[PDB]
Design a binder for this molecule. Sequence first.
Ligand SMILES: [Ca+2]
Ligand SMILES: [Ca+2]
Ligand SMILES: [Zn+2]
Ligand SMILES: [Zn+2]
Lengths: 553, 553, 366, 366
Amino acid sequence: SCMTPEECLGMRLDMLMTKNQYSKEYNILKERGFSTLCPPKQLDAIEKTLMPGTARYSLEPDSVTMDFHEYVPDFPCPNTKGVRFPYAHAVAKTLEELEDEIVNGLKKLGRDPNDPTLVIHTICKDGADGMGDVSVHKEKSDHLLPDKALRFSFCVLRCSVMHKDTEVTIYEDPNPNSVRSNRPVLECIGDENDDGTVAVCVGPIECQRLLMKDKIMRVHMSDGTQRAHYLTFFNSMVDEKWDRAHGGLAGAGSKYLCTLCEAVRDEALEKAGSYKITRTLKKIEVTASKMKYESQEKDTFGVKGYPLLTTEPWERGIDATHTDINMGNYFKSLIVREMAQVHSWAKTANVKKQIVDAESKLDKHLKESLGLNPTLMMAGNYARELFKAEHADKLVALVDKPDRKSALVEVLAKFRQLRKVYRANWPLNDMSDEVRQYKAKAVEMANDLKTHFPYAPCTNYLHKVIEHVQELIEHPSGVGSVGALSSEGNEAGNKLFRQLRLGHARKGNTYNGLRDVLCTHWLYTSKTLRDKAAXXXXXXXXXXXXXXXXXXX
Amino acid sequence: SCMTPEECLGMRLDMLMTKNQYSKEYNILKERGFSTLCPPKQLDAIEKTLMPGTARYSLEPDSVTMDFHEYVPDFPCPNTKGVRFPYAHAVAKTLEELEDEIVNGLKKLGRDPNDPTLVIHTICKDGADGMGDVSVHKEKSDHLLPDKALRFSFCVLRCSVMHKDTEVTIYEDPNPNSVRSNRPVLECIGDENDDGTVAVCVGPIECQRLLMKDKIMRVHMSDGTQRAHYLTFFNSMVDEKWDRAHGGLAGAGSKYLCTLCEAVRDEALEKAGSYKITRTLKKIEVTASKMKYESQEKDTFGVKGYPLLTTEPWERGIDATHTDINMGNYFKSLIVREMAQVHSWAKTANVKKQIVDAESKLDKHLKESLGLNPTLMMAGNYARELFKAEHADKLVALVDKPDRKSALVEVLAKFRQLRKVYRANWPLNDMSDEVRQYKAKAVEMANDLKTHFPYAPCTNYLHKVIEHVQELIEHPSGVGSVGALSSEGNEAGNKLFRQLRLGHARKGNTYNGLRDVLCTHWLYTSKTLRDKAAXXXXXXXXXXXXXXXXXXX
Amino acid sequence: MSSGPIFSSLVTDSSRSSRKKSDSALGTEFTVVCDRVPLRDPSPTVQRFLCFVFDNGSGAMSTLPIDVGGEGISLSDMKEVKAMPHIASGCTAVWGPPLPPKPGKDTKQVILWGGLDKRRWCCSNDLTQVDITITPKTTTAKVSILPADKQDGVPSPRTGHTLVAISSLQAILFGGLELASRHARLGTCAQSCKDGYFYLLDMTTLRWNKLPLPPLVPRAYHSSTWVPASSTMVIVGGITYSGHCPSERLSVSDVVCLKISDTSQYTLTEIHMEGVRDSYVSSSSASALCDDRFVLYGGYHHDKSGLHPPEPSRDLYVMNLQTKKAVVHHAPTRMASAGHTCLRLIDNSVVMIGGTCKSVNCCTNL
Amino acid sequence: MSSGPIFSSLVTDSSRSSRKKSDSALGTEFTVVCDRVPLRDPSPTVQRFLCFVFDNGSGAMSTLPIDVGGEGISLSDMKEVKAMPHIASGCTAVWGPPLPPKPGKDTKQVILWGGLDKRRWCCSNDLTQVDITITPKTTTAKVSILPADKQDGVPSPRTGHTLVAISSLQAILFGGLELASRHARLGTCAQSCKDGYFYLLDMTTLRWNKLPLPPLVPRAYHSSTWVPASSTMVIVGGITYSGHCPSERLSVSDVVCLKISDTSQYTLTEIHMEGVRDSYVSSSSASALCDDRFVLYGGYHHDKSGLHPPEPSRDLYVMNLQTKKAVVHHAPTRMASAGHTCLRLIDNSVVMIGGTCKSVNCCTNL
DNA sequence: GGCAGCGCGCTG
DNA sequence: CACTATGATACTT
DNA sequence: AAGTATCATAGTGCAGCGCGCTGCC
DNA sequence: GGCAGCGCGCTG
DNA sequence: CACTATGATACTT
DNA sequence: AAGTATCATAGTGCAGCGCGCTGCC
Ligand SMILES: [Ca+2]
Ligand SMILES: [Ca+2]
Ligand SMILES: [Zn+2]
Ligand SMILES: [Zn+2]
């Protein structure tokens, strides 16, 4: 008759049904008298079960993100309000989840409850990015809230290095670059350009991350027997504007373009391949103990750096998904430059009229067969149309003088052929000859720009394509890819963040409401829930491919 | 065991549960095997029942809003796409709803199935207003879609004039200025400033409305017996920017300020009380048959008019709810003008610095006890704080020289005392001495501005307060109010309009998706549904007022 | 000199004009005369086409001249004179009767007829006289709207056409109908209502005396311009009263006063041609002329679907109707970006070609 | 002349300055000297306080002078000279040793000590020398950051204070501590760690020789400024190491070198006063001086809650500590909008008062 | 030796 | 060569 | 008549900065 | 007699 | 003196 | 231990136009 509360809790989340609506449906089928879903007092018992902070290591949830006094304005507290977790409990509660997966994951060997025997080598990733223009409330105070929010989350990818000579991957979380495998850590209302605050909220999380990393742990008193793990991370969701203003460097660059190598702006040459690692801190001190702007000024700098270098592990950083936007802003720009017979990238007073008019003509012509409404701030759906295997002739159809047309399609064709390296979730398990030839293939692709075009602008992502990808995937003890290591799982999460706040969560008080954003957003992404909900068997129709016909319909 | 489909259809709408989510919950409790809600194939049978166009008068739904050819571009078709209904079917289907209400509404007389005996005198209202900045799709064409939308809906208020000498109101729809009693007629994607299109979509709806109005009808072959009605309407949701650019007149005015009277800009006198009615059309023809800009130029004009006067019944128009914004922009402006000792409303190069600095001081001081984040485009929630019975001292606390402080609070106190006339749903059933003295009371309120202030600006709504309210409510055969005749039910409906489109309805094709907006938004507001759903009895606690204590908690 | 190059004329930088780049040539209708007082180039050489490229209401700004000099095209003036009470897409007919001259300026009378409404979305028969007068360095304007009071034998108000006439007081021809929606009409306005009539329109006496003929009913939406010099006037296709049957044209139709020393013997004939492919009209407008032949544009710059033939496209068709062996050839087709909205610029005994467009503000030249 | 009016000085129209209306006086720390070279008014009458009102990093723009002339206040210059590598809310100590003069310009040495970090959010002990030199119509600057290499007897880096000293090479006093968060500290940083020590700081030889005394532990967050003319220096309240016990002060505390002809006999005493109400400090800053007494602001322009007393508010307190009958009265309190952030401007044997604020850029005058 | 404009390109 | 989201409807079961 | 599959696409990544010239001091 | 700026105030 | 929407929790049943 | 009631507030109303001066022709 009556039911299981975990079934109801799994039922609620895929609806994104707010709590009062579930109470209303419970009351309706109660008043009609149907043996049905559980009451919410049966829910909020086990709602505190899945909250973090219920394990041990190698009691109030939802801690305030200020953690100092109120009545004494001696510290200049910056304008920020939000809720965070302790990071280690957030690691451990996710570790409680995949325990049963490891049980069916320790196959072809077994020997499962052997604690000092088989130590599991897991590896994950994290990152943070800001927001823009979320609504502001009454706030009853004497200082505003600057419109924006910070979020910090982290995923889980692999769990096998330290295994046998038959070192075999046993769990990959098959999506993996998405929502519903992103566990939240930090939500706060703040701002990051006149920043002041990342050292208040995000700073101590990284100072905890240093104590986390590179250590054998045990999920202490898990469930009956324990289970050990070796935690490893990979910080690469820190896309370029975040990269340098807290990785010490300077954003637009104009002297050193990469946050991995040392390279001149004006080099379209073969390679750099240098891998600066944490040296810059020492070159802070030489600027700090001697003549801040007048010592070693553009003299010893492998790369310019103002501050003393927040978040730590700088030998690993690139994104994949957040390069298609700059690749599109590169190639559509090149097509516009080709459209009117101009040269020398600029907006000169007798050239930019031709440039803007040809760009408007390209916009209307691309509208007459495809879609481009906006002009600025390209979207990834507009990116993927510009690299699909079809529609290549439609992107060049106004370009006369067909030799330039053939070369312009040929460079894009090289780009399609060699684009499959990144935004592939697992290379080294596919396309491995392309993986072992991609450096020479990308040198050829830059060579095609080198001879058919005298322009050669090298923006901040071409140097992250024609180098820093072959050796990056090739590198030992990393992961061996960039695609599954990307940063789209936060961004669709940001699509949820307005959606879980703008008329979803507690309203009427800012700090009391953002906590209820974070609580249900933590409950949204437990795999223990999504394995228990929405898991049925659809009616089979012989793999939905063919009777013997009709690849479509 | 199994259930009623109307119960399920009422269950879905208060959730705003999208159709696939209901299919998902049906599949989940089906796979768990619980005798529960109906399948969606049981829904879409009776989903076509409640659609309009299933009665007769005194078969495809969802007609296209172009209704001419495609292959022949001879007419310059303007950029617009949307879905409308035939208006008369939309009247009749709502008439099918309240039939059972009339059955229990014909009380203390009875004589219910007597068709030529008791003719029911109903009366309603309508109006339209635009939108702003809704997302644009691919559209696969050679012309854009200008970001915006038009909506047109209509309510139902009263149903008793032509009854006995004991002429008694029998149904009032108790909310009534809200959503869930607004039935849609027109949704379209268009624009109204470089308009062209209101004569395409809205125009024929008003040309149908002329054939509708002032006629005894019968809801032909209703349910067993028929039922007659006498339809009457009242177009007043047409707030000021809509009022003149299709009521012929000129928006800012500066010579004639009211769309009911003929009045000079520079008259803060006793009254006007003139009631121009449809005369302007004749003064179009005298400008049309003679010397368009050089005949009767500011000579015969009771009011300036360029065009030949769209939508008809111009003797009735004002809003109540959309005056609090201009009243707040009046009174906060007056408080700012009082804050620094200035005169003569302007922004002079030696005065507007004082004005802006005092306004910023007032903004920060009001922030230190209450809330005002923005500057432009005031909201009604910010309006109602400026007229609440408390907080009056906090709005004047920076104003020194306490005689001006006392007068400034006194004028607002007159405004609170005499504000209860409008935004009351039914005067002539309450506050009737205020109703019979409000003209002299408002003359006194304008007299208070007259003597304690030498400024006297008369904006376009003070003339709609100190006149055109007493006689408007007093007028025979109207309704006898302005408050329940207001225009907020559209605007919260606009809060639903993004909400039923932005990731709710059909997506991927504009015209096919906006139809599914309109269909579920028509299904959202049937009273036959909301009487069948969400109607339970809460657990009583002796009217939730007192045991004998504690007016709060 | 026929068969001359493209001449994409020089665009406007919006430096001293309004914020449109002069791209508002969509939905425009105007006239132009080779006329004196060279107030845009006071030179002893440059004969100048005087012009007012805007004569509309809801299409654009109210009225506007242009810098069509002798050879080149630029800006020379910006008006909003008599700011928009005017007509929708209507016509722009033959010049009115001349006035007594003045020491320094010349007089013009413009007739405007037919069109939609920007306010009612229905028919309109706004007979409109506009007085235009040109002195150096400025002009003036007067408006004379005349509704049906002065009108005698009122024709049915209707959609679209052009109008041609002998230069004083004579016949003005062949409007194009609307299937207008009225009260109780809004369902299935794809019907077919018809007049198809001659009407002689005296310019001063406002009287549409319909000339006697057994009426050829179909094909009244487009036409050509009346020709001098052993005169003729031709109608071209574009309509079947319904919006459902195409107008794939392989012949023409001559409306001409037969003995032009008086105004008599109004007959009608059709002449098949040396047809290149098919489908003379792309359901759009050509209507322009030449000195011994026609200049007929009109094709699809963008291939909106012809109903039965997959024929029509943006090229130029030139008809040798003046020859008794009436044939059709082509000039070398200057396949620019143009098409589907052209307006004329003719000259007798010589080829001098101008034209406008929708928003590709350019020049069609032959 | 003490007890003079408000003098809300004249605001900046942002016509030739940056886009801040000079309202960026929040979180600022500076010095000022009555000094020659009247480069802002070359007159034989107007003696001028020379000043550089910005000496900060993350608080504002990097550095900035001001048009404090003889009497009135305006703008005269806008800098971003040595653009922001500098310190957070730290101190701004006593002027450094003078340099050999030059024909046309004068030399200055500024010491900066203590403060937060805009990048690490922890302690910092940035001992900073800044060379300042003023010629007419422009200046120059040099930066000399010195970390702990040249530092001998390094004190614990800490939150906030002011620093006073005899004009050359002598004792510089009483920083204010942080309950700093470290690794494994983030829960309950409401503890109490203490030093409470004298330290004599030679300006040239970077050595914090801690002067011997049995240490009064509490009350090191605010203080006053050292006074000449039978010298004295006073500490004022504001802290109980915890952020949980208030600092309702009814007495003062004299730190003074006893026999100032040498630098010896460092003692300590407290003196109760003619207390007006209670609670000398509103948990904020006064620290300013006068010529025979003190000028002590600091009260709540906005009443943030005192913990135990409901006493503190925006008025001026003036202490008669120079009198052996040490009493407390008031000057007539110019209750302007000011409060809670004041910086000093003193002069010997006369009352000449200036001050800044958070964003109400004004002048405190007595 | 600065120095504050254009003037724009980098990534948002 | 992100995934997750929407509602008819044509084509299997 | 029940049940997927297919069709096309929206959602969200949303200003500082740092050059490189320039006369121009 | 226009006439196109400020210059802003009306209602959005 | 619009109504409808959100989630604890204090106070009734 | 079940059930309302209370607490505070977000949501949506989101550029044309028409004066009234002005020298300025
Ligand atoms: Ca971001
Ligand atoms: Ca609106
Ligand atoms: Zn690199
Ligand atoms: Zn009026």
